[PDB]
């Protein structure tokens, strides 16, 4: 579970800072939620939770559902915010986020 | 000037590595420019050059112009690049970069 990996108060603050439409910034979010403090192993555990269908990749729909991974009542990312995050992460043209790419997203936050 | 603290060759190469739109990556830039080699006193001296108006802080506009501090002909950071660097550096939420924050920006590169 996400709450075993990260502070509920950190998740609350991080989610709260991006309620406004089109405001999402993955680097600031991942920093605020405390993901930079996690071991490589825990970063991976986070990826697998966000990988809702366990395909081994975060596809677009799971990417838009990312905040719900951290707190279930959070908003979806808009189509545009998702395009932005996919562009930020998908550096190998696969059309989806591999584990390596999520690790990179977090380490570069 | 900056070239009394860092190498001309290093500056030219480091800036040339980020000619492209939205390509700036401060950690990679600080590595390339030779900043990780500097003593703590020289890193502080660097901060003071980048503090263009001598307010004792690097404000948003001065982040925009950070590269010009290294070489006067260098491009501005885009609004997006600037927001990113502010988010990374502004640990205390003061909305500008204090000297301690700059030292941390460099040390964590
Ligand atoms: Ca998936
Ligand atoms: Ca990919
Ligand atoms: Ca200033
Ligand atoms: Ca600050």
Swiss-Prot record, chains A, B:
The encoding gene: Pvalb
Lineage, top ranks: Eukaryota, Metazoa, Chordata, Craniata, Vertebrata
This protein's record includes keyword Ribonucleoprotein: no
Biological function: In muscle, parvalbumin is thought to be involved in relaxation after contraction. It binds two calcium ions.
Residue ranges occupied by any EF-hand domain in the UniProt entry: 38-73, 77-109
Modified residues (N-acetylserine): 1
Organism: Rattus norvegicus
The keyword Acetylation is annotated on this UniProt entry: yes
Protein name per the record: Parvalbumin alpha
Binding site for Ca(2+) 1: 51, 53, 55, 57, 59, 62
Family, per entry: Belongs to the parvalbumin family.
GO cellular component: axon; cuticular plate; cytoplasm; neuronal cell body; protein-containing complex; stereocilium; terminal bouton
SMART domains assigned to the protein according to its UniProt record, in alphabetical order: EFh
